[PDB]
Design a protein around this ligand. Structure first.
Ligand code: MG
Ligand code: MG
Ligand code: MG
Ligand code: MG
Ligand code: MG
Ligand code: MG
Ligand code: MG
Ligand code: MG
Ligand code: MG
Ligand code: MG
Ligand code: MG
Ligand code: MG
Ligand code: MG
Ligand code: MG
Ligand code: MG
Ligand code: MG
Ligand code: MG
Ligand code: MG
Ligand code: MG
Ligand code: MG
Ligand code: MG
Ligand code: MG
Ligand code: MG
Ligand code: MG
Ligand code: MG
Ligand code: MG
Ligand code: MG
Ligand code: MG
Ligand code: MG
Ligand code: MG
Ligand code: MG
Ligand code: MG
Ligand code: MG
Ligand code: MG
Ligand code: MG
Ligand code: MG
Ligand code: MG
Ligand code: MG
Ligand code: MG
Ligand code: MG
Ligand code: MG
Ligand code: MG
Ligand code: MG
Ligand code: MG
Ligand code: MN
Ligand code: MN
Ligand code: MN
Ligand code: MN
Ligand code: MN
Ligand code: MN
Ligand code: MN
Ligand code: MN
Ligand code: MN
Ligand code: MN
Ligand code: MN
Ligand code: MN
Ligand code: MN
Ligand code: MN
Ligand code: MN
Ligand code: MN
Ligand code: MN
Ligand code: MN
Ligand code: MN
Ligand code: MN
Ligand code: MN
Ligand code: MN
Ligand code: MN
Ligand code: MN
Ligand code: MN
Ligand code: MN
Ligand code: MN
Ligand code: MN
Ligand code: MN
Ligand code: MN
Ligand code: MN
Ligand code: MN
Ligand code: MN
Ligand code: MN
Ligand code: MN
Ligand code: MN
Ligand code: MN
Ligand code: MN
Ligand code: MN
Ligand code: MN
Ligand code: MN
Ligand code: MN
Ligand code: MN
Ligand code: MN
Ligand code: MN
Ligand code: MN
Ligand code: MN
Ligand code: MN
Ligand code: MN
Ligand code: MN
Ligand code: MN
Lengths: 49, 145, 44, 116, 112, 149, 101
RNA sequence: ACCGAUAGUGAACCAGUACCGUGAGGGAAAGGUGAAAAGCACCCCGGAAGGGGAGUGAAAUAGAACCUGAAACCGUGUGCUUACAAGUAGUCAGAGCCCGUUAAUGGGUGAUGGCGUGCCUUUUGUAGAAUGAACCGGCGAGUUACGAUUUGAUGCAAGGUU
RNA sequence: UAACUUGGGAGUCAGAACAUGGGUGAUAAGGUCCGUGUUCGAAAGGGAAACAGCCCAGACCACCAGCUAAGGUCCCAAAAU
RNA sequence: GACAAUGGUAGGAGAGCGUUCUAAGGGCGUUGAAGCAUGAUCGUAAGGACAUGUGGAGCGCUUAGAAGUGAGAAUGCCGGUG
């Protein structure tokens, strides 16, 4: 390992999903639609009605 | 674009033809004349230019109909003035000035395009048996099928 | 009543084809080297 | 760190706008309009690439039909007669032969009227 | 060679200056001088002064034959626009453009 | 932060009847000079690794130096030098760590020398060990690293 | 003289001396090539084959092996969120004919 | 492994200031000649403003509204083209005229023919006469901390770990 | 040629027409409420003048190649006066 | 060399392009950097070069690291200009 040739273990790492950046990507509504996919997202943590 | 042919002003010479209308049905003559005019029939046909020939129609007056002549088949026309559908002359119209009856019929078989409108200018219907246009020495053309 | 769509560069230009002062009627002035409007006075 | 936005995108939009060349006025100037016009331009180009293949087939068919009509035979029967004789030579070829060599096309015509 | 002079930042609107300029363009120096003198628009004295100066430094700086000259080209370009406003009814105020123009004139002769 | 920006939290204009868009603060994120959404905030950037791994790494570093070259020397001397460059009478390449038994001063004041660095050995980075090019544990220090295994 | 060869997906009217272009032949550049499949010949004396004229072949020098100018297959579906842009250069041979039959 | 003049303090500039309110209070915009002011003597047009010479300068096509100088937008010159034609502006076909390239089955214009009701949102369904955008520019939205969980990688392993 | 099991991540809970078996309505509705099927949604292409839901039929990309489907073959307009 | 598969909204999954900063390595640059402008250039895409002009300092490449990482729409904010 020569410091200008570092290589992570195959399978050690992979890129985070950046949603909301384009359309070809596949997130632009980002996820869901029309519902409780507001910033609150208040599915009250575990319950129905 | 591998080698198919398209005619232009160089190439595409066009002849004159005389067609007696006497003894003919209106549509049956009008359609075939529309073909001579659009310029099919010849194999140097190509859509974006006038490949068509010139057609004089002699004896417009002797053109023939069927079921109902002066009866039934009306020729309507609005003037874009309100209620003014001054839309009369029955298909009878050949009594009055028939060269329009034929030229209109044949024109209705031509495409609405500027080219189609140029192609229509090559018709020359005449109700009488003689034509002025001998100088462009026309041939007679027997009306096929 | 207000415009419903904007005039194009080109529309507005066709509109202004008649909008121009034309060359004044002028003539060879007093033999004094001047230049004056037609039918109007020489000035000294 | 902070990525100041500048100068990737003035050069993107520059590309798309350069794509809109012969376009009328604002369609060849602004990015939005040019983007629309080029997208649709591509969509039309995709349909029209398919349909062109139709337009040319139909052209040859009309001219062939013409060459046949000159010989008192319909295109409809000249094709069946060629197939029956197994001539298997396409319409672009047939039309161009009709235009370049009336004699040879005549030979084909008789070959088709034969075997009927 | 063929000479030029500019009147930068003049307080006339270019849309207006261009009106007279269009009369002047391509005319012989005397005609253009006349037309400038007799035209009733406001830009006329200004463009007069500019065609004049262009002719002057055409003579002193290039020893040009002041008779044989033509107005090779002439035009106005947008200058900086000072921005004002007028008060209107119900306390609102509205924009106003005090526009300015870079007039340019170029006298010439036998080009080569 | 938007709470942070110096401006006020008065509503820029009424919710309806303007034909302007609804607005809440002149310091809202879509505004010029408004609050920043989700920018950098101060934070640690630092983490733990299992100890055995770290030893395995140091070991791996040095063993990588032996796959190449990490040469061994007698020991140290005096008080101030540009003769250390002359002590590259041994070939000793360009990037340089001199490992020493236990905080040798003086040798440590042979520094402003471009590409060279020294530590103890109880120290001994898993980094300087790699930029490295060529290490030299003196000899005492080499057996020290051996004892620390 | 006049000859019709069934080579690509398609037929060609080669004229002896004439440059042509067809889908790539997987043969050497500069090499000579010959088409086994020929339908028709013309000029004075005319052979008109069934499937093929029973013997004749057109011949040609290979001039170049290359790829056509890129076209840009961009398509999209309005209001539905998709679009798709692919590129395309189509490979071809450029034979030059010599000696029909 | 913070900002680099719409950023970073509201304030890189004599900012809590112009300006706004009876008042508490609110609260901006605005950085860059050059290495050196060597900041254009002098002549010419002009009342001046401005400009052409002549000069300083590597450069003023660096001249003070001064580094670079994009786009919208405004103008001058024109090669091809257009005054019987019904047009979401293009696309496919194509003569004609003009030109000559990162030289490759080239570039510009376009008589004429075919095909063809922008985008976004939102909808069962929008050319839609449903919403949104005058244009161009910059700025403008899944982040971080801590926990839980699961997968991937690595180390030890009846032990692992601080 | 799939099926099930456990685990990670979801979206969806406004539906539309047509054919058919029905309720409701007036054997009214482009009505409404269920059962079965198809298409649209989320599907471009050819036919039905135009015409989401009908008919043929599911576009990896290129061709100035060929056979067909539903529809069609006097002219507009490819193909039988 | 065969032979299959490759319409698609919410959505799941995968491979990648590019921007800033860091590290190490290796390079260009007043014989002219970035930026800008034009071009008929290249790759399957995001995109990458090359030449000439402008400009007058700073920049790329490779491997990996990290993010204020990508805009056309919010009657979005500011500026300019129709
Ligand atoms: Mg609860
Ligand atoms: Mg081609
Ligand atoms: Mg070709
Ligand atoms: Mg009446
Ligand atoms: Mg009446
Ligand atoms: Mg009346
Ligand atoms: Mg019409
Ligand atoms: Mg018959
Ligand atoms: Mg005007
Ligand atoms: Mg054009
Ligand atoms: Mg595009
Ligand atoms: Mg189309
Ligand atoms: Mg205004
Ligand atoms: Mg708080
Ligand atoms: Mg020291
Ligand atoms: Mg293309
Ligand atoms: Mg500030
Ligand atoms: Mg008050
Ligand atoms: Mg000077
Ligand atoms: Mg100057
Ligand atoms: Mg300025
Ligand atoms: Mg400009
Ligand atoms: Mg002209
Ligand atoms: Mg003009
Ligand atoms: Mg067209
Ligand atoms: Mg051309
Ligand atoms: Mg057609
Ligand atoms: Mg609605
Ligand atoms: Mg429901
Ligand atoms: Mg319901
Ligand atoms: Mg029923
Ligand atoms: Mg019912
Ligand atoms: Mg219903
Ligand atoms: Mg549809
Ligand atoms: Mg229906
Ligand atoms: Mg039609
Ligand atoms: Mg019959
Ligand atoms: Mg370079
Ligand atoms: Mg470029
Ligand atoms: Mg340009
Ligand atoms: Mg770069
Ligand atoms: Mg990089
Ligand atoms: Mg990285
Ligand atoms: Mg906006
Ligand atoms: Mn990814
Ligand atoms: Mn999706
Ligand atoms: Mn809903
Ligand atoms: Mn939404
Ligand atoms: Mn939801
Ligand atoms: Mn909230
Ligand atoms: Mn004008
Ligand atoms: Mn920075
Ligand atoms: Mn008042
Ligand atoms: Mn606050
Ligand atoms: Mn409050
Ligand atoms: Mn408004
Ligand atoms: Mn701030
Ligand atoms: Mn700046
Ligand atoms: Mn006051
Ligand atoms: Mn300074
Ligand atoms: Mn004076
Ligand atoms: Mn002065
Ligand atoms: Mn000098
Ligand atoms: Mn500088
Ligand atoms: Mn400047
Ligand atoms: Mn007319
Ligand atoms: Mn005309
Ligand atoms: Mn219409
Ligand atoms: Mn073309
Ligand atoms: Mn149409
Ligand atoms: Mn969007
Ligand atoms: Mn509705
Ligand atoms: Mn709308
Ligand atoms: Mn409307
Ligand atoms: Mn709404
Ligand atoms: Mn609006
Ligand atoms: Mn904008
Ligand atoms: Mn979240
Ligand atoms: Mn339910
Ligand atoms: Mn019903
Ligand atoms: Mn049902
Ligand atoms: Mn939906
Ligand atoms: Mn119908
Ligand atoms: Mn249709
Ligand atoms: Mn068939
Ligand atoms: Mn059938
Ligand atoms: Mn037909
Ligand atoms: Mn797919
Ligand atoms: Mn498929
Ligand atoms: Mn995903
Ligand atoms: Mn930079
Ligand atoms: Mn350059
Ligand atoms: Mn470089
Ligand atoms: Mn990287
Ligand atoms: Mn951002």
């Amino acid at each position: 390992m020569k410091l200008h040739e570092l290589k992570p273990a195959e399978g050690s790492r992979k890129e985070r999903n950046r949603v909301g950046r384009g359309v070809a990507t596949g997130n632009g509504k980002t996820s869901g639609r029309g519902h409780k996919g507001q910033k609150a997202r208040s599915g009250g943590g575990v319950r129905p009605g | 674009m591998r080698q198919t042919f398209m005619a232009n002003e160089s190439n595409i010479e066009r002849k004159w033809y005389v067609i007696d209308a006497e003894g003919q049905t209106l549509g049956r003559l009008s359609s075939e004349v529309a073909s001579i005019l659009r310029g099919k029939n010849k194999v140097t046909y190509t859509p974006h230019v006038d490949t068509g020939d010139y057609v004089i129609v002699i004896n417009a007056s002797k053109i023939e109909f069927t079921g109902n002549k002066e009866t039934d088949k009306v020729y309507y026309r609005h003037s874009n003035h309100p209620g003014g559908i001054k839309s009369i002359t029955a298909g009878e119209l050949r009594r009055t000035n028939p060269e329009r009856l034929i030229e209109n019929s044949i024109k209705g078989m031509l495409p609405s395009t500027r080219l189609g409108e140029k192609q229509g200018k090559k018709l020359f219907v005449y109700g009488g048996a003689e034509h002025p246009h001998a100088a462009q020495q026309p041939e007679n053309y027997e009306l096929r099928g | 009543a207000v415009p419903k769509r904007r005039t194009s560069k080109t529309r507005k230009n066709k509109r202004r084809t008649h909008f121009k002062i034309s060359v004044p009627g002028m003539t060879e002035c007093p033999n004094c080297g001047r230049e004056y409007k037609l039918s109007h006075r020489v000035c000294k | 760190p902070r990525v100041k936005g500048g100068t990737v995108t003035r050069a993107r939009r520059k590309k798309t706008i350069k794509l809109a060349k012969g376009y009328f006025g604002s369609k060849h100037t602004l990015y939005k309009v040019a983007k629309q016009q080029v997208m649709k331009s591509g969509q039309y180009a995709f349909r029209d690439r398919r349909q062109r293949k139709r337009d040319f087939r139909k052209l040859w068919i009309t001219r062939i039909n013409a060459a046949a009509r000159q010989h008192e035979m319909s295109y409809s029967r000249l094709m069946n007669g060629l197939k029956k004789a197994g001539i298997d030579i396409n319409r672009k070829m047939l039309s161009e032969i009709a235009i370049s060599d009336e004699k040879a096309f005549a030979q084909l015509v008789t070959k088709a009227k034969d075997a009927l | 060679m063929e000479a030029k002079a500019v009147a930068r930042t003049i307080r006339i609107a270019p849309r207006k200056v261009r009106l007279v300029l269009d009369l002047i363009r391509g005319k012989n120096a005397a005609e253009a001088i006349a037309i400038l003198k007799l035209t009733n628009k406001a830009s006329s004295p200004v463009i007069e002064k500019v065609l004049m100066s262009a002719l002057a430094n055409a003579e002193h700086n290039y020893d040009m034959n002041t008779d044989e000259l033509v107005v090779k080209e002439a035009y106005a370009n947008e200058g900086p626009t000072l921005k004002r406003f007028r008060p209107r009814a119900q306390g609102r105020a509205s924009a106003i453009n005090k526009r300015t123009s870079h007039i340019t004139i170029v006298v010439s002769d036998g080009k080569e | 932060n938007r709470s942070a920006v110096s401006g006020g939290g008065r509503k820029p204009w009424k919710q309806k009847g303007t034909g302007r868009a609804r607005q809440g603060t002149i310091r809202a994120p879509q505004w010029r000079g408004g609050g920043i959404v989700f920018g950098p905030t101060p934070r640690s950037y630092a983490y733990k690794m299992p100890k055995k791994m770290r030893r395995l790494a140091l070991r791996s570093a040095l063993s990588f130096k032996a796959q190449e070259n990490g040469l061994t020397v007698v020991d140290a001397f005096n008080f101030e030098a540009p003769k250390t460059k002359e002590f590259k009478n041994v070939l000793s390449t360009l990037e340089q760590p001199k490992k020493v038994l236990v905080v040798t001063e003086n040798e440590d004041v042979n520094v402003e020398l471009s590409a060279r660095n020294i530590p103890g050995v109880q120290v001994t980075t898993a980094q300087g060990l790699n930029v490295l090019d060529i290490t030299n544990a003196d000899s005492l220090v080499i057996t020290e690293a051996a004892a620390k295994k | 003289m006049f000859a019709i060869i069934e080579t690509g997906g398609k037929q060609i009217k080669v004229e002896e001396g004439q440059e042509i272009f067809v889908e790539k032949l997987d043969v050497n550049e500069g090499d000579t090539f010959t088409f086994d499949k020929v339908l028709f010949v013309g000029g004075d004396s005319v052979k008109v084959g069934a499937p093929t004229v029973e013997g004749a072949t057109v011949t040609a020098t290979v001039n170049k092996q290359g790829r056509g100018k890129k076209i840009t297959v961009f398509t999209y579906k309005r209001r539905k969120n998709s679009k798709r842009k692919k590129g395309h250069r189509q490979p071809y041979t450029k034979l030059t004919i010599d000696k029909i039959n």
